[PDB]
Amino acid sequence: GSMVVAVYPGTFDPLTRGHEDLVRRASSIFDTLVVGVADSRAKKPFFSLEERLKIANEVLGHYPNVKVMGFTGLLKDFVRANDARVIVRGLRAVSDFEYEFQMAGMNRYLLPDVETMFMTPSDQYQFISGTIVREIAQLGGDVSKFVFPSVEKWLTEKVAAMA
Amino acid sequence: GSMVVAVYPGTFDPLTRGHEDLVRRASSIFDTLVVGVADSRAKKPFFSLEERLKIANEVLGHYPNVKVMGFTGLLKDFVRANDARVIVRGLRAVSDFEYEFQMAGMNRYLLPDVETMFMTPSDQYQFISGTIVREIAQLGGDVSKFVFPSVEKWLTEKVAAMA
Amino acid sequence: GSMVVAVYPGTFDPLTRGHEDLVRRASSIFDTLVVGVADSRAKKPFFSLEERLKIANEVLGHYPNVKVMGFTGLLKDFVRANDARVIVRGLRAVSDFEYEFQMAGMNRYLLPDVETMFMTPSDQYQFISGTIVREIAQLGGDVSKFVFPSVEKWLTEKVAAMA
Amino acid sequence: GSMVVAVYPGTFDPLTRGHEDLVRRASSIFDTLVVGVADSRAKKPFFSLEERLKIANEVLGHYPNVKVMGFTGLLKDFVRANDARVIVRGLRAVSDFEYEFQMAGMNRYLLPDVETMFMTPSDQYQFISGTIVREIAQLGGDVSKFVFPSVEKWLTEKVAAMA
Amino acid sequence: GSMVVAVYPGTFDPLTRGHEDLVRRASSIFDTLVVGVADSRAKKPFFSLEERLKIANEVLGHYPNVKVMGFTGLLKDFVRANDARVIVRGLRAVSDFEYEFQMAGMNRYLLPDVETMFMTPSDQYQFISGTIVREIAQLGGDVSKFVFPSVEKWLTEKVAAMA
Amino acid sequence: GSMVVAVYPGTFDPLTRGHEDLVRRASSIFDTLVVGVADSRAKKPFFSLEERLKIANEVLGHYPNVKVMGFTGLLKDFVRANDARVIVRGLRAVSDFEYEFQMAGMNRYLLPDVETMFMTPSDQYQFISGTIVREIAQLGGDVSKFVFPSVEKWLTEKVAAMA
Ligand SMILES: CC(C)(COP(=O)(O)OP(=O)(O)O)[C@@H](O)C(=O)NCCC(=O)NCCS
Ligand SMILES: CC(C)(COP(=O)(O)OP(=O)(O)O)[C@@H](O)C(=O)NCCC(=O)NCCS
Ligand SMILES: CC(C)(COP(=O)(O)OP(=O)(O)O)[C@@H](O)C(=O)NCCC(=O)NCCS
Ligand SMILES: CC(C)(COP(=O)(O)OP(=O)(O)O)[C@@H](O)C(=O)NCCC(=O)NCCS
Ligand SMILES: CC(C)(COP(=O)(O)OP(=O)(O)O)[C@@H](O)C(=O)NCCC(=O)NCCS
Ligand SMILES: CC(C)(COP(=O)(O)OP(=O)(O)O)[C@@H](O)C(=O)NCCC(=O)NCCS
Ligand SMILES: Nc1ncnc2[nH]cnc12
Ligand SMILES: Nc1ncnc2[nH]cnc12
Ligand SMILES: Nc1ncnc2[nH]cnc12
Ligand SMILES: Nc1ncnc2[nH]cnc12
Ligand SMILES: Nc1ncnc2[nH]cnc12
Ligand SMILES: Nc1ncnc2[nH]cnc12
């Protein structure tokens, strides 16, 4: 047929069960799925880029056609670097639709030949917010329903270290 | 790489410039794109299924990896019949999001291993409504900005015949 | 300054307190406000066009710079006929946004030099649905909170006549 | 404490797993939950009112504090008749929000002392559309993931009878 | 009947007329309404928790079945502590729906037997934003249409003190 | 006819092609269009007010009936100062609708006789986000598709100076 590489970009602070489900689904469609972890300095992420990469690799490493890579520059440049024809984003019934469609429209100007394609996670992950996950973890609450056990370990350790 | 077939289903009453742009974009990603024209009896389409197939074939025939086919039954069965792993739908900033996400969620129960993926047409087609196109044509207004010339011809002829 | 005519188009089946408030507000801004009552045959209106014009004239006649006129063709043609530079539409927090933005976008193709401008009625009218008004009236319920007394009279008489 | 009766009104054409989950949840909060099945003549329901009542009673009869009753008039009057202080509606991420908030706002005028309260079904039922359920059943597709077995039986029998 | 306690949680920075209306409505339905004022450290509230509690007590103290209490931990724990079966939230036509449904869905995992129920304030309070209230007060503008006189006094004093 | 002044207020950090299109459209309708650049201290703008005024004047100066003015206080006061009867805002399919309708509703309390009117930019500018423009510029990416060349120059110089 053809070889199609897709990029699934995000801050992934941290990778949730929603993100993992999207990776499972997208990697079943595309020949290679590149999970692009953006530095996202201005968003003031809880975990460092190095930490977010380790967290994501722990969860996703077993998928044979998934690559986890960080990037500090423009998504445009990361997509081109990976010879990607598709940007995959998760879209849920409770997504920030304004944000998603603005990004897709602007990336459409920056990368006219690259398609943004939206996929949907399983029903049970449709309502997970990363911001709320971090809030719960910081207040000492368990987030096991929302993130994998390995990710819980990172949250617990980071919360304890910052105190 | 792999051979991935996608289905782009719709009533296509008639095929608009928005639909055509989605076909152009989707057929650039997938090895084969099957445009599935649903009979949609209960929706009381303006054009018959035979007519909608002719209209769509006139516009889309030149695309070498696009197949236009009608179906009178369940989308589930049409997808399986075409060995398709993806259902492509257009999503625009003004889409019926309730409708799209309900269909995707229910098809998720009917076809757990098939992914609904949403794509976006060019900015200039984001606001075209087929219902409004038919309304304009029936009142004798030109719809050339919204549909291809071949489709305009069908609308004009059908409007004249029904009077 | 300048002379600016705006058109406020609708089916007005019947004119509600929400519509009247929009007319009051729009007529305070524009030199002339033309209330365009569309025949809307395909929508199967409860009141005939002649009736909808009488209903609207009863409520709006006192406004010195408001003209109520029917039309059976394209809005494009009605706007041009009235030398209008603006199409006014009501936008409420519970509007059919898909519908409104599709119409505005398509009218933008049909009438590039005419601006669709959205105005908001008072809080107390933001949730009035004409469809629900007709439903209540047909089941013999009072709609005085939603329409003016003159309009109530028309609803009562039409409901009684159809039985 | 207090005795609070709530009404859960709908067309219920037919009762789905989403509706049943809402009944389970609402009946756990309120002393009595009255499921009000509206005749909804103008909506042209697939099942008659008598049929919709039988369908709902089959599914809901086992709940000791749930009453299933039909009504042919105004919801206002049905609520007052049942001494209800609350109207419960399901709200899902894919609800017709325009419709729900218009109804709540208008019922607020009709019944100022009655509160419309929105509840959410389980994630797995958030995307079920009754319209799509009927469409699938009419095309001979199984809807067991969306409705209870007793309801499937009614759909099958009605579809067979209408052919 | 039964004794049902509901919690109405929020940052309440400060309590607005919208919040007060929701308390009035909710306390008419539930046997006890607990207004839970979250510390919300990360949100960087304008008023301290102690101040927000005083502000809310001044407005709400007269309601005989309303309790105002602060909390520094998880909502889950506060709900359980108060033996509450319901979390009440205000939902307006201009609510952050993404945020509300994410919280409800995640609390559904944390507290499966507790129902999030959404209520609607009066039309006249549907468009009040606390963020905009604080912005106006900080720029020396009157917010009496949006908050009670006692709350205005707190805003004025805090604005003057911070300068 | 009449002399109608409208205010188009914003932070304009910086003025984008979307804003410019709205100014072009609004200034064709109103006798005078005042572009009000709010200090917006709390939003922590990238450009100072003086800079944002220079940026906007460079782009908009050629429009004979457009005035660009800064303000540090309440919009209410700026509107009254300019004898304005209309506040114009851009509304796009991807707007923050919550934010826009809250502002309009609250300004409706502050300025009952002033109408907020929403206008729509051309399709090609509907998806431009100022936040994303700043993000791209800070990462050294070209934003020429989103802002005028003069504005690009300001972004480049400010980015270089802050490093
Ligand atoms: C990181 C990304 C993809 C946004 O992702 P996000 O919404 O934080 O992902 P999340 O982890 O929430 O799923 C976006 O900000 C991005 O692409 N950043 C890189 C810089 C860039 O190219 N910006 C222009 C985007 S149009
Ligand atoms: C036809 C289709 C795809 C809806 O398409 P549509 O929204 O009319 O497409 P449009 O032409 O408007 O782009 C849908 O109704 C469908 O799949 N119909 C076939 C019967 C079926 O399987 N229904 C269950 C859908 S979950
Ligand atoms: C009638 C109108 C304005 C829609 O109004 P509406 O939403 O029914 O108005 P309502 O009475 O609900 O406020 C629209 O259907 C129209 O313009 N009809 C005339 C024919 C036409 O030109 N159609 C193309 C619209 S892009
Ligand atoms: C039937 C009802 C509740 C709408 O329900 P629905 O959305 O069809 O319910 P569904 O079965 O889809 O869950 C509504 O149309 C109604 O109340 N009808 C009775 C007549 C009436 O009072 N109408 C005024 C409603 S404000
Ligand atoms: C405070 C609350 C309820 C959000 O309220 P809010 O939207 O700030 O309320 P407002 O005052 O705007 O009406 C929420 O952040 C919360 O529950 N915080 C406590 C910590 C917690 O349990 N977080 C998990 C929420 S799923
Ligand atoms: C600046 C403004 C108009 C918001 O604009 P904005 O959304 O930042 O505009 P943008 O540049 O994004 O187009 C608003 O915050 C404002 O009016 N600020 C002045 C102070 C004020 O009066 N606030 C009350 C607003 S109801
Ligand atoms: N729960 C979730 N599922 C998929 N994509 C997401 N992006 C953010 N949250 C998500
Ligand atoms: N204009 C449009 N573009 C893409 N898909 C669509 N589906 C319906 N209208 C569409
Ligand atoms: N209540 C209302 N107010 C203004 N415009 C409307 N259009 C339809 N309903 C309306
Ligand atoms: N799936 C569903 N769940 C709850 N309420 C509903 N109303 C309509 N569909 C529903
Ligand atoms: N105005 C308002 N009314 C009710 N709940 C709210 N939550 C935030 N603002 C609100
Ligand atoms: N692209 C855009 N067009 C018009 N108004 C806007 N406000 C913010 N972004 C805008």
Author numbering:
A (entry chain A), B (entry chain A), C (entry chain A), D (entry chain A), E (entry chain A), F (entry chain A): -1 to 161
Paper text:
We prepared a second Bp PPAT protein sample that contained the full-length expression tag and which was concentrated in the presence of coenzyme A (see §2.1). From this sample, we obtained a crystal at low pH (4.6) that resulted in a 1.6 Å resolution data set of the same crystal form as the dephospho-coenzyme-A-bound structure. Since this structure obtained from a protein sample containing the N-terminal His tag and the product-state structure described above resulted in isomorphous crystal forms, it appears that the presence of the N-terminal His tag does not affect the structure of Bp PPAT. A second structure grown in the presence of coenzyme A only showed significant electron density for the 4′-diphosphopantetheine moiety and weaker electron density for the adenine nucleobase. c| map centered on C4–C5 of the ribose ring. This strong negative peak led us to believe that coenzyme A had been hydrolyzed or was disordered beyond the diphosphate moiety. The remaining electron-density features fit well as three waters and a sulfate ion (the crystal grew in the presence of 0.2 M sulfate ion). We note that the feature modelled as a sulfate ion is unlikely to be the 3′-phosphate of coenzyme A, since it appears off the 2′ position when overlaid with the structure containing dephospho-coenzyme A. The crystal grown at low pH in the presence of coenzyme A resulted in a structure solution that showed clear electron density for the 4′-diphosphopantetheine and adenine moieties. It is unknown whether the lack of electron density for the ribose ring and 3′-phosphate resulted from hydrolysis under the crystallographic conditions, hydrolysis by the enzyme or is reflective of disorder of the coenzyme.
